[PDB]
Amino acid sequence: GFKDYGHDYHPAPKTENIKGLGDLKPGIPKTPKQNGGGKRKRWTGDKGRKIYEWDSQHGELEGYRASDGQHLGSFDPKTGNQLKGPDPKRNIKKYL
Amino acid sequence: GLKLDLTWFDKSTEDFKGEEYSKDFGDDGSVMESLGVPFKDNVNNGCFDVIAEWVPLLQPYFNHQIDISDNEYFVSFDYRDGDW
């Protein structure tokens, strides 16, 4: 039943509570999941040079370089601290 | 509970122009039922393109006067325990 569905994934942070990455604005969401009809919630920061996307299974922001989509690592929305570092294999270049 | 998280963007520039949450639905998902969005893998898991059909179904829950000829709209189905 429905509450159960609501605990399947980690709720995304509301924009105002994302700390430590500067001023942020939601961006048009474009990255599909394979299971789910949704596109990943998206924010831009640093004049749009940085993109962040909520990953609702791990419960962290994945950060990307807007110019080419390169992955930058993940960040704790409460602090803004880097948690994972860049993964050269990962980018969002087809979803920019 | 469940809030519809509504978000909209300029068709010309894609700039962000607004965000509004519906009131809390508690644990009643039927609004998702009326959109035709299964619960499975869809709660706290992304945003959906607000299509023309969805406007009438959604508008009753928002102050924003949804205008799909002006803006691209997206909704997500956020669920958090309690009041939030």
Swiss-Prot record, chain A:
Query: Would you say which domain of life the source belongs to?
Result: Bacteria
This entry's comment on induction and repression of expression is: Probably induced by SOS-stress.
Site (Stabilizes positive charge on His-513) found at: D55
Segments carrying the region annotation (Disordered) are 62-96
Span-the-membrane segments of this chain are: none
Give the consequence of mutating K84A.
No loss of cytotoxic activity
Q: Where is the active site?
A: H58 (proton donor), E62 (proton acceptor), R90
User: What is the recorded phenotype of mutating E62 to A/Q?
Assistant: Complete loss of cytotoxic activity
Oligomeric form and interacting partners:
Native colicin E3 is a 1:1 complex of A chain and protein B (cognate immunity protein, Im3); protein A is 1,000-fold more active in inactivating ribosomes than the native complex. The cytotoxic fragment (residues 456-551, C95) forms a 1:1 complex with Im3. The receptor-binding (R) domain binds obliquely to its receptor BtuB without displacing BtuB's central plug; binding unfolds the R domain. The N-terminal 83 residues (T83) bind OmpF; trimeric complexes with colicin E3, BtuB and OmpF can be cross-linked and immunoprecipitated.
Q: Which family does it belong to?
A: Belongs to the cloacin colicin family.
Its name, as the record gives it, is Colicin E3
- Source organism: Escherichia coli
Gene, per the UniProt record: ceaC
- Span of the entire protein shown here: 456 to 551 of 551
From Swiss-Prot, chain B:
GO MF annotation terms: toxic substance binding
Induction section of the entry: Probably induced by SOS-stress.
Biological process, per Gene Ontology: bacteriocin immunity
Q: InterPro entries, per this entry?
A: Cloacn_immnty_fam, Cloacn_immnty_sf
> Keyword set for this entry?
Bacteriocin immunity, Plasmid
Instruction: Mention any Pfam family matching this sequence.
Output: Cloacin_immun
Q: Has the keyword Metal-binding been applied to this entry?
A: no
Presence of keyword DNA-binding: no
Q: Where would one find the signal peptide in this protein?
A: none
Give the quaternary structure.
Answer: Native colicin E3 is a 1:1 complex of A chain and protein B (Im3). Binds between the translocation and cytotoxic RNase domains of intact ColE3, blocking access to the 16S rRNA substrate. Forms a very tight 1:1 complex with the cytotoxic fragment (residues 456-551) of ColE3 (ceaC).
Note on domains (UniProt): In complex with the cytotoxic fragment of colicin E3, Im3 residues 39-45 move outward to form a wide hydrophobic groove at the top, which interacts with an alpha-helix of colicin E3.
Q: Which family does it belong to?
A: Belongs to the cloacin immunity protein family.
The free-text function statement in the UniProt record for this protein reads:
The cognate immunity protein for colicin E3 (ColE3), protects cells which harbor the plasmid ColE3 against the toxic action of ColE3. This protein inhibits the 16S RNA hydrolyzing activity of ColE3 by binding with very high affinity to the C-terminal catalytic domain of ColE3.
| UniProt-recorded name of the protein | Colicin E3 immunity protein
Per the UniProt entry, what species is this protein from, by scientific name?
Escherichia coli
